[PDB]
Design a protein around this ligand. Structure first.
Ligand SMILES: Nc1nc2c(c(=O)[nH]1)N(C=O)[C@@H](CNc1ccc(C(=O)N[C@@H](CCC(=O)O)C(=O)O)cc1)CN2
Ligand SMILES: [Cl-]
Ligand SMILES: [Cl-]
Lengths: 286, 289
């Protein structure tokens, strides 16, 4: 019968704390606080939030797209996932001074930083084979050979690449950690949109830990979410007020449906979310 | 539920590691207890978080920061000030066990001094003339605070993968982010690895002071220092000393005074700073790993 304190309670309490204690400014207008941390257990559960329906197909296709090393919004949009599309549009690139760049070209965003770190970005169709540091593979290789290493870090915040990117990274850095055959990951997110992005961000890095745990032969342990600037847009306060009234249902489980040897070999069909019973969708105006 | 404040957050982390920390070995052989992921918020508002449950080497904190600020990677330059904490990490015998034999005694690699004033430059040696090369992240932080304080990208890096091959001891501190609201400056430090007994009380005072410095140059008031840890470990040989420390009751934090209006970060001198109403318990000797 009795269940552990649901992990969603940490998110909802970060909401209620920003609503109660945050200070107001602009950017549509925000309530904001600086410095938060929550710990989401990954052991026999998957922290896909239940107090609204989170866009799981979005989370999954987006990560498969990072791992592929794509920086082309259209490669994701073609999977039915539109979330990067406004950032690669003609006007949006133009208004950043990227007028010679083709539609969709996001510059050196996550997929590039993860697979080609430090290489010279040209364009999104370019071939980067064996340029840059493949941080993701190095991470996997170190977990498999020295799991006690205290420098297992993948870096997305690259100061040289900021002026080339269609969006500055929300996510600065990941650190991985292994104890007793369990893999944890802590994400430093320098800026979080709490209503609209964070529930998605939480599912993303939890899924990346599951995938890494899978290919390194380990068990998923915790996902530690650390925020810098944590903000709620004002147009989200009322919907969040309603979200807070709802009771979390038990987290679902994530099944991986076959043995996968390499990280580039995961496909969308290898994943099954099971027993996901969310409260109804909440639309937050982006 | 009311969170622990002040020094008590530090004693509680120690206590959680002693109890819940699992046994591991590190790259020095010494044995550690470790946990992963921790966070504390140290107010800087009309107090300064120099630990009182043991005496912290304040002149060491101050002098080390002044050394980072001037761009230095040479342990010898801090040593000559009477502060020996980086000595061991630049010794022939420590350097030798990292294929770093062409590097002169005391050349620490592209550590914090290089990273803050010359980021993304090409390191060589500790004597080399780096004027005009790399990004001066520290000056950038300051100027951004004066011009666009609401900016949520005020981040200073010490962790550069491209430079990892060139380093003896790779940064314990990966990044700082800075944050301004209602004319208050906060700083959050992401510490990928924290030696809880020896270094972390030094790290706390250190980044506190940096925040106080950048506040003063910008005419802002100090907000909070948020300390976030990745791997947080206690050396086995630190347990007995820490057990002694944990039975002592904390006394109020002291106050930090800046004794004159300084213009630029580089112009701060040791004598500009006064610590007032520091009443710590006795020193507790702990062995450096
Ligand atoms: N083991 C270890 N090595 C490290 C660090 C660390 O925290 N731990 N550091 C992390 O950045 C750097 C140096 N930091 C240090 C800070 C303080 C002391 C120390 O022994 N403090 C004494 C001061 C006594 C005195 O000299 O008067 C003490 O407080 O007991 C050592 C290293 C580089 N290497
Ligand atoms: Cl090409
Ligand atoms: Cl002035």
């Amino acid at each position: 019968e009795p269940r552990p304190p649901h992990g969603e309670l940490q998110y909802l309490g970060q909401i209620q704390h920003i609503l109660r204690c945050g200070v107001r400014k602009d950017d549509t207008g925000t309530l904001s606080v600086f410095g938060m941390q929550a710990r989401y257990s990954l052991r026999d559960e998957f922290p896909l939030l239940t107090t609204k329906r989170v866009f799981w197909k979005g989370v999954l296709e987006e990560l498969l797209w990072f791992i592929k090393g794509s920086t082309n919004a259209k490669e994701l949009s073609s999977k039915g996932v539109k979330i990067w599309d406004a950032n690669g549009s003609r006007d949006f690139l133009d208004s950043l001074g990227f007028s010679t760049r083709e539609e969709g070209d996001l510059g050196p965003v996550y997929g590039f930083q993860w697979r080609h770190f430090g290489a010279e970005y040209r364009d999104m169709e370019s071939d980067y084979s064996g340029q840059g540091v493949d941080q993701l593979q190095r991470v996997i290789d170190t977990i498999k050979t020295n799991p006690d290493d205290c420098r297992i870090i993948m870096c997305a915040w690259n100061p040289r690449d900021l002026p080339l990117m269609a969006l500055p990274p929300c996510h600065a850095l990941c650190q991985f950690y292994v104890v007793n055959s369990e893999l944890s990951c802590q994400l430093y997110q320098r800026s979080g949109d709490m209503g609209l992005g964070v529930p998605f961000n939480i599912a993303s890095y939890a899924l990346l830990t599951y995938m890494i745990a899978h290919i390194t032969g380990l068990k998923p342990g915790d996902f530690i979410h650390t925020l810098g600037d944590a903000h709620i847009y004002l147009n989200h306060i009322e919907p969040l007020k309603i979200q807070l009234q709802r009771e979390p249902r038990p987290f679902p489980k994530l099944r991986i449906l076959r043995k996968v040897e390499k990280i580039d070999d995961f496909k969308a069909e290898d994943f099954q979310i099971e027993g996901y019973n969310p409260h109804p969708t909440i639309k937050m105006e982006m």
